[PDB]
Amino acid sequence: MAEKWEELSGKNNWEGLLNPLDLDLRKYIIQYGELAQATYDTFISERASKYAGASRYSMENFFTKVGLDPSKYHVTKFFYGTSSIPLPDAFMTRSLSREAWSKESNFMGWIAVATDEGKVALGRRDIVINWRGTLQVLEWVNDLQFLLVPAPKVFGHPLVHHGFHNIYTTENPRSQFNKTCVRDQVMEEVKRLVEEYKNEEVSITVTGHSLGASLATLNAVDIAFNGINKSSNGKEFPVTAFVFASPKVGDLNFHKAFSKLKHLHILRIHNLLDIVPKYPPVGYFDVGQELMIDTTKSPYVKPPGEVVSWHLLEPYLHGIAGTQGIGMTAGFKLEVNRDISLVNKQWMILKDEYCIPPLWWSEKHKGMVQQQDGSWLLQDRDDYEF
Amino acid sequence: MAEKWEELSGKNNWEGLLNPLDLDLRKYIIQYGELAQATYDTFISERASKYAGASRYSMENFFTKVGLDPSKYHVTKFFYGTSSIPLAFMTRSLSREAWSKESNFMGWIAVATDEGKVALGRRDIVINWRGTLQVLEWVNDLQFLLVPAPKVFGHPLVHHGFHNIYTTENPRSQFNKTCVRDQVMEEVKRLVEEYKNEEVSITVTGHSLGASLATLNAVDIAFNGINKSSNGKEFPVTAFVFASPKVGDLNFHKAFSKLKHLHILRIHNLLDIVPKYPPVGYFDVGQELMIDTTKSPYVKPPGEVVSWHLLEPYLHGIAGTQGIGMTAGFKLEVNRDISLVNKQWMILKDEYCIPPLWWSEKHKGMVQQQDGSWLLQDRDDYEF
């Protein structure tokens, strides 16, 4: 698995590994989905929080508090993004507090690098870039406009989604955390990590779900097109992206530019009934390889479901954990021992018989802690500096 | 406040203390409301829990973990009840290892700490009945047959469903071989016997259905002399009930008027539809204080029948009530934290930055195991 890491990261574009789904690739896709789901588990969406839109966990406590292995990667940077055009009021979370940490920016994700122990298990010094999407579907997928605009910061022919590009490249000199656009905050950290581990074997892996999957895809093409995976000593490091429930990013020239990048491979996970991969409806093209799943075939989920349940990431990972194909007689059986309770972290999806509470990923008292006064204050974020 | 405890407990039926609302009685009503609210804060309503319908906190951890002062009272018994007629009222677990298929935690009894006695002015025994957070699932469909209560009186007619929960016993059940009535009465007697040489008071609290059960339970105590000690004393019985539906008919009220060691203060919110139940043939008992939570500039207007009914809005209403008159207004006379009204619902305005329904355990009881999986372990380790 560590010895086969190049093939698992798409060296041969996952040919022969998807139908039937290879067992080690099944684990591979899930573990990078866990790093993408970690962006959701740390993101404060409660507008009452004076840290709404920010990560509630510091970089040091990160993997432990999101329920993952803290021995494998080490978080090095949180990156933040802002916008400047009319967007659906669910892309950027805005605090109701007068002591708000920020009025322009949101936590867009985090970058981590494999530890020494993790490098043994992974097979190389892996640099992971995880982009945050949103939990909401109905609030944007049917109303967000999809104008095609150029991306000079990326390509200097290719046209790209106007909304995704604006979030990706908007700067603000009067802002506290987005004087540089989120793109550059990512690239500077990727460059210093590539420089830091230039004497080792290094891979770059981008993860994302929903809107984060579109930003991750554009980010992956961006890294490979501009040689940000090339070190100062002449090494080319491979760029790989595992994206989930991805809406389309660019047009035909964007696909054409993606095809020329020979050190880049994308694997998109697509749930049958999920309507988000349909977006945008005209003029856009997918890029990379695609694995199809159908969470409807799972006997654990509550039939019949809804568009939110077919879109969220933990159902996707549960679907990958048990997928046997999407054919009419494929069935469903868990090939990995992935806890089914994870599916209820942000929604009600499991059947009642499994006795898992709905929307259970929640801090104690939703961040309220009692004072010596006996009153209660919302203290929902770790003590760290931005 | 400790020297005036008899007046605050209704020695003179709170005459001269309700309008304008005396400040010591205002704090007094809120204090007993907090004890009633602890019945909701410890109750596991999540049907996914193996312990649905039971208390999530042990009696040892109770006051600290419900956010109250743990040096004033000390919990001495959890009591349980079951039913035998069709009635939401009883929470049923979906687990195949459910702690109980018949019973629910109906409330708790505590006794004044030594230091609590100095603060309260006497050794007060408190019995707190649990109600419900739901309204429209029963207030417009629950039948209200008038039935006798032989265990209570031996003429008064009382609500069929309330009496059935109050008196149903079940051999085969783990926790209700005795009805919930006898579980309360036995603990009350031994506490009266244990403190028969001191000043003792009995205070019953309750909200919603808990208020009706608390009303029936307080009348039951005074009528059968359960407040009487073996050394001849007759300790006063006081009931502070919130958002109470009615309990009995005119003979129930007539039997209440003859009990001169009993006093009941009902807190009634203007727009709350629950105090109208049942619609015909029933009568209120005790003294009444009217409030109007919709006069508060803190709550998101105009609210709904759930917002007008829950206990924490009631206590916030009492903390800031100036009367229900058109030009009365609203202003907090005590420093009660407004965030408490968002414990079980969304009520505050957005500007106050308090999350909705925030009373919740970490991960709603989920606990990660050493292998990375999660189990629902949402109850203290204690013996039922």
Residue numbers in the entry:
A (entry chain A): 4 to 159, 168 to 397
B (entry chain B): 4 to 90, 93 to 159, 168 to 397
Give the authors' words:
The phospholipases are classified into four groups according to the cleavage site; phospholipase A1 (PLA1) cleaves sn-1 acyl chain, phospholipase A2 (PLA2) cleaves sn-2 acyl chain, phospholipase C (PLC) cleaves before the phosphate, and phospholipase D (PLD) cleaves after the phosphate. Here, we report the first molecular structures of plant PLA1s: AtDSEL and CaPLA1 derived from Arabidopsis thaliana and Capsicum annuum, respectively. AtDSEL and CaPLA1 are divided into the following two domains: the α/β hydrolase domain containing the lid domain, GXSXG motif, and catalytic triad and the C-terminal domain containing the dimerization domain. In addition to the conserved α/β hydrolase scaffold, GXSXG motif, and catalytic triad, plant PLA1s have an extended C-terminal domain composed of approximately 70 residues.
CaPLA1 was selectively expressed in young roots of the hot pepper and hydrolyzed phospholipids at the sn-1 position. In the case of CaPLA1, there are four molecules in the asymmetric unit. Among the four molecules, two molecules make a homodimer; the other two molecules make homodimers with another symmetry mate, respectively. Each monomer of CaPLA1 has an overall structure similar to that of AtDSEL; α/β hydrolase domain and C-terminal domain are almost the same as each other. CaPLA1 also has two disconnected loops resulting from the disordered residues; Pro91 and Asp92 between β1 and β2 and from Asp160 to Phe167 between α6 and α7 could not be refined because of the deficient electron density map of the residues. The disordered residues from Asp160 to Phe167 affected the surrounding secondary structures; a pair of β-strands (β4 and β5 in the case of AtDSEL) were not found in CaPLA1. The AUC result of CaPLA1 also suggests that CaPLA1 makes homodimers in solution, considering that the molecular weight of the theoretical dimeric CaPLA1 and calculated from the AUC peak are 90.4 kDa and 86.0 kDa, respectively. The dimerization domain of CaPLA1 is similar to that of AtDSEL; however, more residues are involved in the dimerization. In CaPLA1, His376, Met379, and Trp387 of one monomer and Trp371 and Trp372 of the other monomer make hydrophobic interactions. Therefore, the dimeric interface of CaPLA1 is more robust than that of AtDSEL.
